[PDB]
From a paper:
Nuclear pore complexes (NPCs) create large conduits for cargo transport between the nucleus and cytoplasm across the nuclear envelope (NE). Here we use cryo-electron tomography on DLD-1 cells that were prepared using cryo-focused-ion-beam milling to generate a structural model for the human NPC in its native environment. Our findings highlight the inherent flexibility of the NPC and suggest that the cellular environment has a considerable influence on NPC dimensions and architecture.
The nucleoplasmic ring (NR) shares scaffold nucleoporins (Nups) with the CR and anchors a distinct basket-like structure with diverse functions. For the NR and CR, we used a composite Y-complex model derived from overlapping crystal structures and threaded models. It docks into both the CR and NR in a reticulated pattern of eight-membered rings. The NR is also composed of two eight-membered rings of Y complexes. In each ring, we observed considerable density beyond the Y complexes. In contrast to the IR, the diameters of the CR and NR are nearly identical to previous models. However, to accommodate a flatter overall assembly, the CR and NR rings flex in relation to the NE. At both the CR and NR, the Y-complex rings are angled more inward towards the central channel.
Residue numbers in the entry:
A (entry chain AH): 493 to 651
B (entry chain AE): 333 to 402
C (entry chain AJ): 1078 to 1145, 1176 to 1195
D (entry chain AE): 671 to 874, 891 to 922
E (entry chain AF): 14 to 164, 171 to 304
Write the structure that this text describes.
């Protein structure tokens, strides 16, 4: 139409409407948004998020979701549902144990540090983990604890 | 009137009593206030009422002490 | 091992009556308040999140030591808002 | 007119002396009360005399009204922690234990300075005994038992038995903190002091209750509603 | 920028100011030195008047705003948090005063829709909303209570609980609390030509001749006084007539000097002489 202001708003609305429960459905496999090249390559984040929420392939889907969240949190896809997406992605990492994240734990830590010193609005009913919280900093603290546990139980894997 | 010595001298020249939790002046024979009777003539000097407006006050006090004085 | 000791104390309290975790968190925040611009802000945010979780998961009377309850929470929220406005 | 002219400049003793020499007793008493409420710390006889050695007591006036006016002025101009000691020690409280307990709740900080709290709790019993009070006496008892419990916990760290009056003190603290549920009270400093006194003794005895109020005020007011059961929230 | 009403505390303690920026600042005056302590903010409209409570019930200070809400914040342990919040009015609040210390902790607030709320504090923080609708035509603009006049037993004496309120209908209708529990209009004072701005009652210094000053937008300042007690006879007396409108009108406690504030951005002190006519003492500023 006029510029990319309408496309960015539509993408933000779709991302806010998709994130409302545990599984980001609603507009699953019904986004498309194909126009020229510059106006079509900007909709890759929504497609990647939909593919990660629908299908899952070992840690590849988790890595793709983390990359999409890090790309959206870098002043790209607005900043309304970015905190909610980050809190929903941190709840499936290692909040109760220890896991591993190749080229992702440091990025998540940097995103949590940048979102805490700027502005952060999280509002999405995830599951039983989000209902037991209260403040918005609890999700960031849990993500930091999970990242620390992963770095402590995974960086000692020398060859 | 801005000194405590005058208030202390005036409070000792009266007989007050507690009546219904309220102090009232029953018997009084003198007061050391401004422009009073014979006890106010000693509080009007050159270091209490300046000098440009002290003679008139002293004359008014003396006239009141000589006329309305017992 | 201060964090591990605090976690062990909180577990031992929850295994009995659970009435000292908030006091321990307040004492820790008072002992380690002056830090820096980022570390201090992160510590304040963690303390606020812990206080919110404690207020959400509790229902009886009133218990909040090392905090000069409602007034202390309001003062902490005002300080956090002032720090966020100054850092941004 | 003379009392007004003497009070408009700053003289309190002269204004009181001019107002005492009136005709009507009801008007004179009201004028004396107004003059005492307007200024009382500048012309006080008791507690460090500085008004030419008893200025208002020599005019056949009662010392109970001047002390009450000075206490009411100090409670509004000065702090509440220092104005409570001048009201209970003036021997003119007359069933004023609630105000003293509300004013003493502001000094709930500084756990190392419990001597002032102990002195206030010891002095509150003399005023209640002199004012003929033998019914409502729970806040002072709870405040006196909290300091003793804190001292016993700081001195002895191996004891964990019941202290007889500990259950009564906990029940009194709970009844005082549940004011919003009993009579719907919006107290802040008093509630914070009660919570601090109830939580300072929970690290030695048992204290099964003493918490917050579910998620009805934590997830609907600003992510802040007085912490309490952080151990139960972060553990299982 | 521009302040509205700023009243003192108790015995010259703090000074609660209120401007049009929705900021209720509580500045302290220590030996003539102005120093701010806290800035209570939480209203959507501009703050109007502000009145402090008595020292027997702690340290409360109520302030009205233009957001159709009345905030009553306390002061204890350096925490100036809001205790009660009354928003029972439909229009903006103009004036908000308190009652005497002998009757309890009642607060009368006048709105711009013709109503007068009466927040009466009970045994704690619960306040009973006892508003009276149909109190004015275009809305109330002033609220002030009368003095505590005491009427062989061991109980408190029930006062008349009188409060004179002014509105935009050129009528200073005084209220009186009946024995049932509801308030009613005792008498009306229709002596102005425009909308009444402020109307504060003079405090009695033991005498039974209770007076009440009022100021309208026409420039006239009426001083209604009573001849004796228990007599519905409010004889108004014109004090001064200016070309501009008047703002507020306060009275002293010693000589009951009327402080006429308004006109050409200047305050004037009016005092009753021995002949009965009111004359200007001096000019402020």
């Amino acid at each position: 139409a006029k510029d990319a202001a309408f496309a960015t708003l539509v993408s933000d609305r779709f991302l806010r409407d998709y994130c409302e429960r545990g599984c980001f459905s609603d507009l699953d496999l019904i986004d498309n948004l194909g126009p020229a090249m510059m106006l079509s390559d900007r909709l890759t984040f929504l497609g990647k998020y939909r593919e990660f929420h629908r299908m899952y392939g070992e840690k590849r889907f988790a890595d793709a979701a983390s990359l999409l969240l890090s790309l959206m949190t870098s002043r790209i896809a607005p900043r309304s549902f970015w905190m909610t997406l980050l809190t929903d992605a941190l709840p499936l990492l290692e909040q109760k144990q220890v896991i591993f994240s190749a080229e992702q734990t440091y990025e998540l830590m940097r995103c949590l540090e940048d979102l805490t010193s700027r502005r952060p609005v999280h509002g999405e009913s995830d599951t039983e983990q989000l209902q037991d919280d209260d403040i918005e900093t609890t999700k960031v603290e849990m993500l930091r604890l999970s990242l620390a546990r992963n770095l402590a139980r995974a960086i000692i894997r020398e060859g | 009137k801005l000194y405590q010595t005058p208030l202390e001298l005036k409070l000792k020249h009266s007989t007050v009593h507690v009546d219904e939790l309220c102090p009232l002046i029953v018997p009084n024979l003198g007061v050391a206030v401004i422009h009073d009777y014979a006890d106010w003539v000693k509080e009007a000097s050159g270091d209490l009422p300046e000098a440009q407006i002290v003679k008139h006050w002293s004359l008014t006090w003396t006239l009141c002490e000589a006329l309305w004085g017992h | 091992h201060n964090y591990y000791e605090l976690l062990y104390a909180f577990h031992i309290y929850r295994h009995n009556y659970r009435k000292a975790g908030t006091v321990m968190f307040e004492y820790g925040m008072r002992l380690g308040r002056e830090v820096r611009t980022l570390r201090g802000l992160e510590k304040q945010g963690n303390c606020y999140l812990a206080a919110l979780n404690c207020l959400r998961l509790i229902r009886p009377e009133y218990a909040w030591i090392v905090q000069p309850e409602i007034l202390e929470l309001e003062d902490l929220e005002k300080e956090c808002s002032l720090a966020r406005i100054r850092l941004t | 007119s003379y009392a007004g002219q003497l009070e408009s400049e700053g003289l309190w003793e002269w204004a009181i002396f001019v107002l005492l020499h009136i005709d009507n007793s009801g008007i004179r008493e009201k004028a004396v009360r107004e003059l005492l409420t307007r200024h009382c710390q500048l012309l006080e006889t008791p507690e460090s005399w500085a008004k030419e050695t008893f200025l208002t007591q020599k005019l056949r006036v009662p010392a109970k009204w001047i002390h009450e006016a000075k206490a009411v002025r100090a409670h509004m101009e000065s702090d509440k922690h220092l104005e409570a000691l001048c009201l209970f020690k003036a021997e003119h409280w007359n069933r004023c234990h609630k105000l003293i307990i509300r004013h003493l709740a502001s000094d709930a900080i500084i756990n190392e300075n419990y001597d002032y709290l102990k002195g206030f709790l010891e002095d509150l019993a003399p005023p209640e005994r002199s004012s003929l009070i033998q019914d409502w006496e729970t806040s002072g008892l709870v405040y006196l038992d909290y300091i003793r419990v804190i001292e016993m916990l700081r001195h002895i760290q191996q004891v964990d038995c019941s202290g007889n009056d500990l259950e009564q003190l906990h029940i009194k603290v709970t009844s005082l903190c549940s004011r919003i549920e009993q009579i719907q009270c919006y107290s802040a400093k008093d509630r914070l002091a009660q919570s601090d006194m109830a939580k300072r003794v929970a690290n030695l005895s048992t204290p099964d209750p003493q918490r917050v109020p579910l998620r009805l005020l934590a997830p609907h007011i600003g992510r802040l509603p007085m912490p309490e059961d952080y151990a139960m929230d972060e553990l299982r | 920028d521009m302040i509205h009403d700023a009243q003192m505390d108790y015995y010259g303690t703090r000074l609660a100011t209120c401007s049009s920026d929705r900021s209720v600042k509580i500045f302290d005056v220590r030996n003539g030195g102005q120093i701010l302590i806290a800035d209570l903010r939480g209203h959507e409209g501009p703050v109007w008047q502000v009145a402090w409570a008595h020292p027997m019930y702690g340290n409360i200070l109520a302030s009205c705003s233009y957001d159709r809400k009345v905030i009553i914040w306390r002061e204890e342990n350096g925490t100036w948090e809001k205790s009660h919040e009354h928003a029972g009015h439909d229009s903006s609040v103009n004036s908000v005063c308190w009652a005497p210390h002998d009757y309890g902790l009642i607060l009368a607030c006048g709105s711009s829709d013709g109503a007068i709320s009466l927040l009466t504090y009970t045994g704690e923080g619960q306040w009973e909303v006892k508003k009276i609708n149909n109190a004015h035509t275009i809305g109330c603009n002033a609220v002030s209570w009368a003095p505590a006049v005491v009427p062989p037993s061991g109980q408190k004496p029930n006062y008349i609980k009188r409060f004179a309120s002014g509105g935009c209908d050129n009528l200073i209708k005084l209220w009186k609390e009946e024995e049932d529990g509801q308030w009613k209009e005792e008498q009306k004072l229709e002596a102005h030509s425009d909308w009444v701005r402020d109307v504060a009652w003079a405090p009695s210094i033991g005498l039974p001749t209770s007076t009440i000053a009022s100021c309208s937008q026409d420039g006239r300042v009426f001083i209604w006084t009573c001849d004796d007690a228990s007599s519905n006879t409010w004889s108004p007396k014109l004090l001064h007539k200016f070309n501009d409108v008047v703002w507020h009108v306060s009275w002293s406690i010693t000589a009951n000097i009327l402080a006429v504030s308004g006109g050409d951005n200047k305050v004037t002190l009016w005092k009753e002489s021995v002949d009965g006519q009111w004359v200007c003492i001096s000019d402020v500023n």
